[PDB]
Design a protein around this ligand. Structure first.
Ligand SMILES: Cn1cc(-c2cccc(-c3cnc(N)c(C(=O)N[C@H]4[C@@H]5C[C@@H]6C[C@H]4C[C@@](O)(C6)C5)n3)c2)cn1
Length: 269
């Protein structure tokens, strides 16, 4: 849970920077082999957000979710995680526009498998976006960023946000905007936007639109168009994820099964 600074070796090259801080490559010396790791180095309120994130990550074990190695207190607070070398899905596809639909279907399916586990475990992610899916290889994706994530109470099936902070509104379902209600079916809406992103090769969704204009668009029943080259069955699945009414919107068991069948039917040719 708490790592040993002596055994942690960081490299001076920053992989990515932001408001959260920087991410760096490092090596953690285990029992025999050393393991390459990604280290989130936070630059009072900041400490509790990473501890809470760490406590969430510790509870989750799945091939399609980035694992936490532990936390370390040095000059800065550090969250040590499995390294996803190829980095964010959106930036990867922006720089590799020859990746084929069969490969994108595979990647989003792997995300549907990770979210299904999360749904089974009664965790809501609350920040599912192409920028938060990381590539271990071109054929292996992992969900990351659990800083907004909540373990649901054993008697409730949603989480009610009190504070309206800086929200990525374009990934958020209608009930998140109007009632601040976050459930696994809200993540399903975000997964729909993640699919559009994946098949649009890292294009921003609702481009040139403010968050209020998007809400108005969804309220008129309008939905983003089919990306160039995206198969019809995946776009139908996007639209199903963008079901306004939360009761008629599917959970990730249905979403993942839908993705599983179509992928195997696309393969074999
Ligand atoms: C921004 N950026 C990031 C890169 C970038 C480039 C190369 C590798 C990684 C990488 C590898 N293995 C990981 N486990 C994480 C990893 O867990 N990263 C977290 C996630 C959640 C927050 C904080 C932090 C960076 C973020 O992008 C946003 C993903 N990140 C990230 C390029 N640009």
């Amino acid at each position: 849970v708490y790592l040993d600074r002596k055994l942690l070796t960081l490299e001076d090259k920053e992989l990515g920077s932001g408001n959260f801080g920087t991410v760096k490559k490092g090596y953690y010396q285990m029992k025999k082999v050393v393991k390459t790791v990604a280290v989130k180095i936070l630059k009072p309120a900041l400490k509790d957000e990473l501890l809470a994130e760490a406590n969430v990550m510790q509870q989750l074990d799945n091939p399609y979710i980035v694992r936490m190695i532990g936390i370390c207190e040095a000059e800065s607070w550090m969250l040590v995680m499995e390294m996803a070398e190829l980095g964010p899905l959106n930036k990867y596809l922006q720089q590799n526009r020859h990746v084929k639909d069969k490969n994108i279907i595979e990647l989003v399916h792997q995300v549907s498998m990770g979210m299904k586990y999360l749904e089974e475990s009664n965790f809501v992610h609350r920040d599912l976006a192409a920028r938060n899916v990381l590539l271990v290889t071109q054929h292996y994706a992992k969900i990351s960023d659990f800083g907004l994530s909540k373990a649901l109470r054993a008697d409730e099936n949603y989480y009610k946000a009190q504070t309206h902070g800086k929200w990525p509104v374009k990934w958020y379902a209608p009930e998140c905007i109007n009632y601040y209600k976050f459930s696994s079916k809200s993540d399903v809406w975000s997964f729909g936007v993640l699919m559009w992103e994946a098949f649009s090769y890292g294009q921003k969704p609702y481009r040139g639109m403010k968050g209020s204009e998007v809400t108005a668009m969804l309220e008129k029943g309008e939905r983003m168009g089919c990306p160039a080259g995206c198969p019809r069955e995946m776009y139908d699945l996007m639209n199903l994820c963008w079901t306004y009414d939360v009761e008629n919107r599917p959970g990730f068991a249905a979403v993942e099964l839908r993705l599983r069948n179509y992928y195997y039917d696309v393969v074999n040719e």
